[model samples]
Target: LEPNLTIVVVSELLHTNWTDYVCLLESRFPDLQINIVSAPQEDALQMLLDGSAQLALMFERLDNREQFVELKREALIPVISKTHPLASQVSYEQILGTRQIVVASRTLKPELLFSKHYWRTDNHHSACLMILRNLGWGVLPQEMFKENPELNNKLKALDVFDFTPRFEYYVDLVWSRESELGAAARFLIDYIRNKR
Candidate 1:
């Protein structure tokens, strides 16, 4: 039987670079079964707390649980399609009035409302799809654009505007228990921490 480790990772962390990045983990632990659940931050934390998941990647710090590691912080950059009407004349006042493509969860990141109305998607990549179509303006992590240049080229990052509501995609690890995690889970965590 293969030893299995289940992980609930928030969707923002599962960007284009991760598709190939995760391949390395599976290849390294050929003998172990790694199950990854991509979900919102709140759900990820709840899933791990319920014992259904051994590890979770989320924004909040689980201090008392003794099961967390601050991995990385990716800046969220505002973006819009290059061909959009206001691409050249971007402004916070104009953006606030337009539809904003944002993640559905209130737990993704902390920020005041960017717009009065918006479209909601579960993950960063999905949000990009809408922005690409000129459906609305939104923010996404820089690595998302960096890994997928083809998509990045079509979009204009709204960096000039100061009140665009800044935030970052924070990747933090939370596990079930210190002593309860078996070899497979231990190996997975270590794999994420540069031992890969």
Candidate 2:
């Protein structure tokens, strides 16, 4: 049997662009088969702790600094469909009136715009789909949004007035420092840190 390396990744990071990006590793390590075990935020950590997962990629970083590395900081853009009442750019006051679609368990990036009038979904992509269906305005990572221009053209990234600080979607690489990694996992971690 071929050696297998298991990685537990967050649902949000399972976009087309990410799949294409990680394919490089698969090609380079042909001898070591890579198996992805996708998990939500809560379950992801436990998978690592129990040795079920050798590597992890997630939006939120764990408390163990030694075990986690910040991969990329992408922008989080607030978006809505063109048919929405606030089809054009929306302001702080306008946002309050509109229903915001948020991901479950994660806090809204821009705390100022968060309101009681909101909808919650399992993940960012679900929230984006909900927004596309005119459920509500939502925030999505630019990486995932840029993959499909057809859908992107249908939606607009809202330009907020007076919101200076940029909202970011942080991707983190996590593993158990106490565990001895196999050759494949070691190579993956090294390659990601230096090249990705």
Candidate 3:
């Protein structure tokens, strides 16, 4: 049997980019195998605490959006579609009142925009994108938006007017001491922190 290294990753859904990105690591460690377990917010916490997986990769909400204090956080870039109304603005709004659909995940911090009434809920990012393509606005990591220019232009990215959602999509690497993570885990954490 392949040595299965279970990892819990949170995003809109299973992403091919991650598969491509992880493929790069195999050259360094041939035996590397990743068994990914995906989940939305809150549920991800349950998965982690229950020992269903070894590590957590979450796109976290900024300090203001969090329901409780996050133990740790790493800054990630803001993402916007090209069709986003505020894409060309100078200063971004901390709170955008635009119609929007949010991809709620274990990483979503609840205090900021969650308080506002405009944020729409969806099954995942894909569902959010479907709405965004038609009537709503959305936000994601900068790289995620950039990876697909076709869709980015379909809507748009805006600098929040008065309040820029002014938030960060924090990607955190979390683990427990009782479990053993393999080289892929080590390299993944290293790459995310040291690389882009």
- The number of clashing residue pairs in each candidate reads 0, 0, 28
Question: Relative to the unseen true structure, what is the C-alpha lDDT of residue 63 in candidate 2, on a scale of 0 to 100?
Answer: 58
Q: After superposition, how far is residue 186 of candidate 3 from its true place, in Å?
A: 5.1
Worst 10 residues of 1 by lDDT: 104-113
Candidate 2 accuracy as lDDT:
0.72
Superior by TM-score: candidate 1 or candidate 2: 2
> RMSDs, each prediction?
3.2, 2.9, 6.6
Q: Encode model 2's per-residue lDDT on 1-196: one tens digit a residue.
A: 6688888777766652456335866787767777887888768877888788888887764656238767776677777888777784467777777898876543545563464598877667788788888888877777766777866777887777864446675778788887656887787678778875
The superposed Cα distance between candidate 2 and the true structure at residue 97, in angstroms, equals 1.4
State in Å the error of residue 82, model 3. Answer: 7.6
Best candidate according to lDDT: 2
What lDDT does the true structure give each of the candidates? Answer: 0.71, 0.72, 0.52
For residues 75-126, could you state the per-residue lDDT of candidate 1 as single tens digits? 7687789988877675667877889898654443536358878877877778
Better of 2 and 3 by TM-score: 2
Q: For residues 1-196, write the lDDT of model 3, one tens digit per residue.
A: 5665676666543432345445756666677676677876456665655667666665544222222213233222334445545454444333344455565543445653432444545343564465455545555544455566665556544544464445454445566544555667667666766654
